[PDB]
């Protein structure tokens, strides 16, 4: 991890988590605020972002990774992530049958998946499990990891926090393959990914 990213995550509120928690999610949680908000150790969050990035880089066709989100705040972030890292995008409704119905107008057979919220995108994860497709998801303290192969701890609700996490991932995916070096900071700003 780097110091600049930590301060950016602190203004992101990525560390902040919901007042409800899951036993599987406890490893990531660092501590609980007096109100009940569960902070996440940012270093543990970062290790997930880079571990997930390595898996995203192992696909030969980057346009065969489907990024799906129903959350309104997540819409801009997923599209920006798809522009910077070539990838299929599903904005708004997932549309049932997208991954299982051959005659779907949006028929995509992906070899990975990205979902902003396990709850808001329950249908997407369910279909990925019908066709052998892995799944990577951004997860808050109440995380049902059923059918979620890899999960990145984050607020995932705050509009800004959703934007930074996709930017932190886009950035690192692009760096691992080539493009921007990890020495040279990305020209694109994470405020582009966040939607007012």
């Amino acid at each position: 991890l780097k110091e600049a990213d930590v301060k950016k995550m602190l203004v992101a509120t990525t560390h902040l988590g919901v007042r409800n928690i899951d036993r599987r999610m406890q490893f990531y949680i660092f501590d609980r605020q007096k109100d009940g908000t569960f902070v996440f150790n940012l270093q543990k969050v970062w290790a997930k972002i880079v571990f997930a990035a390595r898996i995203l880089v192992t696909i030969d066709d980057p346009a065969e990774i489907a990024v799906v989100a129903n959350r309104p705040d997540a819409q801009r972030a997923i599209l920006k992530f798809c522009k910077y890292t070539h990838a299929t995008a599903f904005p708004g409704r997932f549309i049932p049958g997208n991954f299982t119905n051959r005659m779907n107008p949006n028929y995509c057979e992906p070899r990975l998946l990205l979902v902003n919220d396990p709850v808001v995108d329950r249908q997407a994860i369910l279909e990925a499990s019908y066709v052998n497709i892995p799944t990577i998801s951004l997860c808050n303290s109440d995380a049902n990891l059923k059918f979620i192969d890899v999960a990145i701890p984050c607020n995932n609700k705050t509009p800004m926090s959703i934007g930074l996490i996709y930017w932190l991932l886009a950035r690192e995916v692009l760096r691992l393959k080539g493009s921007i070096s990890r020495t040279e900071e990305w020209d694109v700003k994470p405020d582009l990914f966040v939607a007012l």
Binding site: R102, E109, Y130
Partner: protein, 199 residues
Amino acid sequence: WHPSTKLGRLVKAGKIESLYDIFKYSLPIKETEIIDYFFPKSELAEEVCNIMSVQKQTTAGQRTRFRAHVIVGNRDGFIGYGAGVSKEVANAIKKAAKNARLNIVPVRRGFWGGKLGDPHTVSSKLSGKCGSVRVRLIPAPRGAGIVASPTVAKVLEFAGVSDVFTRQSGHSRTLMNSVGAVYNALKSSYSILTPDLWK
């Protein structure tokens, strides 16, 4: 024929060697044309059994539709049981055949005692349950044959299991449930971790 799935498109190239390759990656087969690609000589043996007339009561009267069940398999190591329902007996048989080819699964097979050469029995005691009926497929000596109910016997001839000792538990008069059970047991043939596959 135009391949509809990115797997069927790798099968139109010939990139896939054998049905077993796909089974080792547990892939879902969606086009019956892919099974036909790996079965060139007159496809594979197919049998129609239990064509049932099912009636839905309407205001006007009962709507009779036909549920056919079809087993497809080579006489070596593959078995698929599928079912279709159509008002036309023939249409349902075609749908059943298509479903049967789509659900073709491998059978491990094995030796009761002597390991002289070709596997002749089931690998272990395999069990499957559909509705009430539960089946028990137990290895048999080379002298024994398929000791099974006529319906289960056809499924074991079309799976390449020469000799097996079988016991059915439940209403095995329901042939749809009966074939389903001996198919689910023959789908567990590659799900059992034996000391042979421990490495």
